[PDB]
Amino acid sequence: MKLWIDTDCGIDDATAILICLANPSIEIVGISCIGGNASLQNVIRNVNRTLKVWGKTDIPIFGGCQAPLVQPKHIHGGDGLGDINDNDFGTNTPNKLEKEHAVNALIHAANTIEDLNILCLAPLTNIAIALSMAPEAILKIKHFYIMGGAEITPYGEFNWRADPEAAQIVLQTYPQYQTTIASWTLAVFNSFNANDYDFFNLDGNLVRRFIRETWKPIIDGGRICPADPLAAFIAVYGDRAIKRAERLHLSMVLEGEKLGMSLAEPDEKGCLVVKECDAELFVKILRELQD
Amino acid sequence: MKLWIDTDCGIDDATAILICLANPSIEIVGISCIGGNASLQNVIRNVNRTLKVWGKTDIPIFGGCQAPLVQPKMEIPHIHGGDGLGDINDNDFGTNTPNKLEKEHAVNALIHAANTIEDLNILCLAPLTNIAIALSMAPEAILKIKHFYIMGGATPYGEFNWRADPEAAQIVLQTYPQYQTTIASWTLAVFNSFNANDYDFFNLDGNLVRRFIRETWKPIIAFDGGRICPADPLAAFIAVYGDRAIKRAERLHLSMVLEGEKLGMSLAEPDEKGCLVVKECDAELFVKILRELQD
Amino acid sequence: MKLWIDTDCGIDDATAILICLANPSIEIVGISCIGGNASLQNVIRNVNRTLKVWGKTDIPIFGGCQAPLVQPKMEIPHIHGGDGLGDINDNDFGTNTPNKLEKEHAVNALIHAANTIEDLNILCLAPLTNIAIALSMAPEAILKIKHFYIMGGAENGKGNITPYGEFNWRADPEAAQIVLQTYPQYQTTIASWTLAVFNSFNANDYDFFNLDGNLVRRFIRETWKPIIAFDGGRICPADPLAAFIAVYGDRAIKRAERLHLSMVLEGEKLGMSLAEPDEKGCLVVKECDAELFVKILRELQDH
Amino acid sequence: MKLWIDTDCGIDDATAILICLANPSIEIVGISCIGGNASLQNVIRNVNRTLKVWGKTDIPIFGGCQAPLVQPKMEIPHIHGGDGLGDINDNDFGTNTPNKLEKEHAVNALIHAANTIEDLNILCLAPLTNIAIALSMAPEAILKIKHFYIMGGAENGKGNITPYGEFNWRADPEAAQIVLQTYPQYQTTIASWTLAVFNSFNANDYDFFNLDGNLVRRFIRETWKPIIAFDGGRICPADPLAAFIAVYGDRAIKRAERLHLSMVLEGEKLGMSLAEPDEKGCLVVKECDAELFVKILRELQDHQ
């Protein structure tokens, strides 16, 4: 599976990225960066940290837009990655960043790489702009896997509320039938008690140290809500990752008091909205990658 | 018992406030608000909603500081909802009315209360920002206060109040006598957590208070995966029902870790002049109290 | 003055481009295209016609976006004709010749222009989709642009296509908001639809739209005929005024008003410009020097 | 210029206050006190001494906090003497008179001043405890203040009380961080310790702190004696430089850089100021008009 990743690399992004790095059947052809959890510069820094920790700097990193499309301007720390110390990980080395804008690089990849899939872990600003400039190219992409949206209070949702116009563009331009959704609701339904589960609190190697220290601030009232990892889990392990799912046509509320929330109607040509995951397989995947 | 309450009235604060209102030997002399779970503006709204649902709007409400002393704000709408009180609908409660707010800052109002109300007690349900500012400005006034009852500190993973403003907690722990301090810790709240599919006392109807409790606890229960962790209610239970609420406690000298990887955590050391740190409550009496306030 | 032009070249766009072509102190560095008055395809053809009629076809033309950022296209009555330029015949103008079009998308071209050409100004004659996207992708580059001259909005609150919104900003209100909340309003001059109605002429009292003797005079006469025939000869020449201001600086402006503007992005007033007095908002021109303007409109048609 | 002064009136504070008292276009609307060089109680007495010696006891004095926000009190050698003012004898100055002190706490008084006095400016000569509490309680009121002039920090990272920290900001780094992240840094001018010993004078080649013949000369001469005795005769006039900058504006400033400043709140560099070029940050003064400065210091001591 050839996979592009769009990220606002904060903490759960980095672990999502590791889930893709760990599967040998996955080929990451590019990572685009967008502001969100942290500034665009911090996101590029943090993608670099994540790749350097895993030991595969083989993947081109593209910088995207710095702000949401229309809406004006944290939890993942000051640096967006749990305020970790580069000297404790050996990641105080120059960062790689390609010259092409993330929008142009994604268009070129969609135009030239066959059977390209995309994993969207962030507000959809880069994607929406790409769809605006070359919809024919982006429409060549085989499948969209998106973390975002909510049905558990919806006010925990970040990606689509952060740029509801970009989400609307995606949802009305790229075919929803070829779209799978890992929602914020799903991240809370499949959440774990960190007083009962230890898979984000190991040591022995660089990977475990990285996961343990990055997740510490996010672990919320001591719960692990693994939104972006679940999205990567679904993208990489397909139907085996999914227990329950429903087909829903989705749209953004772009005005009024519910601005940024989403509307969903049962529709068989709509998004595949995952409603429950295989948590046992999920944890096993998380543990295996930390070997 | 004259009681001052400091709160960032989200969901469990509101139920804690109701415990105080429901016991007729408690006189709430004022409620001060601090940002925490939600913005200060939402906390003021939520304190007003709680008092109007109970039917006793004669208690003065003071607004305090907007942010922690130095740490950034850490609002938690994924747990307590966008408004901090589970996004209830005022039109279901008749609370779509103007909010009361006194003109004085909560810091000066607390100082004045401590100077003028004898045997004043304080129940702290939030990051200790307002209290820490009052102790720096007028330690001599705040030290007149008879006893501190504090929800905070922890070990489980997710303590909020002292981690949210660890400098403020340290100011309290190093300025107000720990012997006159009783702690309802996050450990206690986790120890006394209930499963919502086995206990129904937050799922009743028939009157306004039952509807308030049921609807406000909906989002936070769902976030904790079907479990009720009644942190602030336990603190109010301990303050109101005294040694009757306490089954086991230890005297511990507490301090905050203000630097390094354990920033926001506490140290605890056995000490008979430290805080009274509650280890076990009478869970049976507690559930009884929770039900009776809804009658 | 180096100038980039973003246009949905219909009739009044074309006259505005000619106003810039006629002034020898103006260097048109590029012309980007966006749908508006007509489809993108037709705007490209029409910019080609305009340059060919003037006789300066060495200006690069770039195609931009096909649809507004978020809003649907909105079925509007094709006032500028089926082809967007009054349905002229290319055989009547000798413009039955190959078109020119650069390979680069207009957004990337605009970014590259703003990075490499010093003291670049931009004249915006159309919905701001291309400019908004350029500002989202590379705000640093577009913020290098010394000044924005923009035709759009309605300082009063009553425009053409809706009672609240002027056509360009109603067509893509999010794009207009993006420009107005991202590019400095103080460095922006607005030629509103209300300024266009204020400086409105009746074409049966002036003859500068009814000459022949050369190709430019025919081009103006034939293209403007539909607009003149719409509302009994009263022409609100918005884009030509915008160019007039952009080319002739303080001389186009005698009275103007500083208003910070923002878009209404919901409700019936979708696309309306809100104006609030603010001395570092947009320079919203409220009346022009009509004498110099008619003199300019005549001069470009001289042999 | 309406000016609020916050001080731990030790020796250089007092001279800084005299610089403000001496210029007729400066109106001191109030003086708040915080512990530092000495205890709060000594600070209040020392502000009283200064005002009595100058002969303008018309300015209200407010007592502020009793300790830093959260840090324990430093354990340092009292360079400014036991009373915080070089252990002078009140009999040498006629200052054995009642001390004035308003009833309102300095925090509430400052908030009230910021709410009611137009074009208010503040000169901060001490750990920023009073100011940070006022910003925590009522940021909207304190943000009405037109400009902050602050003695503290060391942008080059060379402190005094620690290798990394200047005394005011190391004594209460949280307070300093509070000011720096709440009051607009663009409206803040910094007179750093780096400015202080760049403009350091050796007192055996300069005499302007060693005159006699009137009460102000005796005061300055006697109070500065221990500070001079400290580092072989080198005077680093930090607080006077801050007041000089506050009172004489552009004429006081030779060179400056716009820098965003941050506090180190943990580890061995606790209290150090980080600095990064930023056009909306603090105006960090790099060099003062030393000639005008000495001139100013002499004129206020003139018999005339």
Ligand SMILES: [Ca+2]
């Ligand atoms: Ca993410």
Ligand SMILES: [Ca+2]
């Ligand atoms: Ca609380």
Ligand SMILES: [Ca+2]
């Ligand atoms: Ca146009």
Ligand SMILES: [Ca+2]
């Ligand atoms: Ca001082």
